[PDB]
Amino acid sequence: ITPGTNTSNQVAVLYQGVNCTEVSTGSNVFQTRAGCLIGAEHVNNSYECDIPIGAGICASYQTSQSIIAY
Amino acid sequence: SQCVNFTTRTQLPPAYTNSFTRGVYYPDKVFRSSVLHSTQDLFLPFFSNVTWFHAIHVSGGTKRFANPVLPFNDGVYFASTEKSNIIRGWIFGTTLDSKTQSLLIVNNATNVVIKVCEFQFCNDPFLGVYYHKNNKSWMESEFRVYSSANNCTFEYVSQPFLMDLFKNLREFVFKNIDGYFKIYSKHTPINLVRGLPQGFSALEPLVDLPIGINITRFQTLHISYLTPGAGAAAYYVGYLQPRTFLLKYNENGTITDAVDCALDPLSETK
Amino acid sequence: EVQLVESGGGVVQPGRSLRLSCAASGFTFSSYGMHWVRQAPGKGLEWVAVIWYDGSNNFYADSVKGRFTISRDNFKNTLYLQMNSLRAEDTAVYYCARSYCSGGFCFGYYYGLDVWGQGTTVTVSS
Amino acid sequence: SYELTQPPSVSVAPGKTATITCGGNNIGTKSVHWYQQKPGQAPVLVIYYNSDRPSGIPERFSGSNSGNTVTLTISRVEAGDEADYYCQVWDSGSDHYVFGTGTKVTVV
Ligand SMILES: *[C@@H]1O[C@H](CO)[C@@H](O)[C@H](O)[C@H]1NC(C)=O
Ligand SMILES: *[C@@H]1O[C@H](CO)[C@@H](O)[C@H](O)[C@H]1NC(C)=O
Ligand SMILES: *[C@@H]1O[C@H](CO)[C@@H](O)[C@H](O)[C@H]1NC(C)=O
Ligand SMILES: *[C@@H]1O[C@H](CO)[C@@H](O)[C@H](O)[C@H]1NC(C)=O
Ligand SMILES: *[C@@H]1O[C@H](CO)[C@@H](O)[C@H](O)[C@H]1NC(C)=O
Ligand SMILES: *[C@@H]1O[C@H](CO)[C@@H](O)[C@H](O)[C@H]1NC(C)=O
């Protein structure tokens, strides 16, 4: 999961259909129904889907900007 | 010849820096214009650990600082930052004694010499110059690198020239594959005062020699300025790895930029 | 008081040996490389051997290689020359001389033999 | 071995100058020293580093080394300058200090 390289070089990684224990590995782990998401800060707010991750989970790049999952 | 002996032998501690994005070279000699081309070869990975040392070329004062023997691994990116040409060459081999063949690439003032022989190298390979006051010029007159050289398998002497005895950055890539020792080189005038400069510069193919020997270690050769009686040269070593690189050729064929695919997920997506 | 005093010369038959000496005083002996230069009667100067300031390096002449040995004692300020298998062509006056060593190097680009000894006579005759 | 050539004899009138030629192979790349030896005593360094005089040698002596032309020069020649003169180099190509053949300088 990446915004445009024109925007940033920071990226998040999705391991599809795996548990967040068999897994580079930053301190932003988050277990989605689609797998394990690493490098995205889970957010309790709800916005429009920007980058689809799956199971209703999407990712954006927002503010000190960072990749957030919601 | 006859090796010069030094009673006090020491070597400066190694230091560490980062490769930034240097070491890129042209894998093939194919003219490519305004295109992205992908190739898997022995490349210096971006932001790779680099070990750097100093080549002390003056004594001012009876301590001999010796260059260390470094591993070769799968190939080496060797860079030098100096004003005058202090770094003169290297020796490559496995045992670096008379038991095995050894490659010697040296650059004396006249021409470049490349010889593959059963060398019995000196403990302290020496290249010495003295200043000719009546001619206002430096003349190198000491060359004591090996005590014996028998059963040679390679020799090459380039045409004579006159080497001049604002820093200069001289980059080389050495790759020992399929009996060929391939060397790529690049020279740029750098303005930095300390450390390896950050930037991108594609190394062009210098020459590939069919030496057909095994190389696991190497050592650097420098020049010694004999004075009657502080700005020493600095060299940097990184190691190549089998990597897939995406090179960008402009309209004239120059590699303007590169992407290390396996560096990070962003580069993998690229 | 800078002076060099040779000794040990003598008259000898071919095959025999002889050890020459050169006592130095008045200067820093361990800062100079020491030479031997012989002069056959009526003939020119011939360089014999050199030893560097700390005795770590020594170079010999082709005519004496394998028969002559040079050495120095730095806590006694003395230069030595061991001469074995002497021949009639070794007959000469033997001089010792100093030359300044730059910084661990006694090649002889910047300095020459600035101080010579009186000499010692060696004759080899049957 | 490495050869150092000198003319065997040079004659000069008092007050004039004498030039002594040291002949060497690539001697323009070497550092030549000169020694004066009057009959009966040890030689004396008169020129080192091609052109430098020791502290006591008078300024009449001088050396050059330019264009494969190494030369000892003695202006205002006196009778006391009658001696043998040798050039000397360090030849790293053979690990030998080489002395020239010598030049006898008699004052006419
Ligand atoms: C990058 O995005 C900016 C908008 O912030 C745009 O002006 C620029 O043209 C974009 N870069 C490229 C190469 O299109
Ligand atoms: C992940 O593993 C833990 C312990 O191994 C388990 O309790 C949990 O149910 C697992 N979750 C998923 C989604 O596999
Ligand atoms: C989101 O809200 C839950 C409670 O509904 C809370 O436990 C959790 O820590 C919150 N997460 C963040 C990132 O605020
Ligand atoms: C470079 O190597 C040193 C030890 O050789 C290590 O401590 C350091 O973390 C390395 N740097 C990187 C970026 O891995
Ligand atoms: C060179 O090789 C030959 C045989 O190939 C061997 O007899 C000889 O001893 C070798 N040279 C030396 C110095 O050992
Ligand atoms: C190619 O070389 C020409 C020569 O002047 C230059 O004008 C042009 O900018 C170069 N191409 C690139 C991509 O720099």
Numbering used by the authors:
A (entry chain A): 595 to 617, 634 to 673, 686 to 692
B (entry chain A): 13 to 72, 75 to 179, 186 to 249, 257 to 297
C (entry chain H): 1 to 126
D (entry chain L): 1 to 108
Extract from the study:
The RBD mutations found in Alpha (N501Y), Beta (K417N, E484K, and N501Y), Gamma (K417T, E484K, and N501Y), and Delta (L452R and T478K) are located in or closely adjacent to the ACE2-interacting surface where they have the potential to modulate ACE2 interaction or disrupt the binding of neutralizing mAbs. To understand this, we generated 674 mAbs from Beta-infected individuals and performed a detailed structure-function analysis of the 27 most potent mAbs: one binding the spike N-terminal domain (NTD), the rest the receptor-binding domain (RBD). A detailed structure-function analysis comprising 22 X-ray and cryo-EM structures is presented for 16 Fabs most in complexes with RBD or S, which allows an understanding of the changes in antigenicity of the Beta S protein.
Beta-43 is the only potent non-RBD mAb described here and is highly specific to Beta S. Finally, the single potent NTD-binding mAb Beta-43 was completely specific for Beta. The potently neutralizing NTD-binding antibody, Beta-43, binds the NTD in the so-called supersite region. This antibody is specific for the Beta variant, and the Fab/NTD complex structure shows how this specificity is achieved, the three-residue deletion in Beta (Δ242–244) causes a conformation change that impacts on the supersite and will likely cause more generalized escape from supersite binders than the individual amino acid changes also found in Beta NTD (D80A, D215G, and R246F). Of the point mutations in the NTD (L18F, D80A, D215G, and R246I) only L18F is part of the epitope. Although the epitope is slightly removed from the site of the Beta characteristic three-residue (242–244) NTD deletion, comparison of the Beta and early pandemic NTD structures reveals a knock-on change that significantly shifts part of the Beta-43 epitope, conferring Beta specificity.
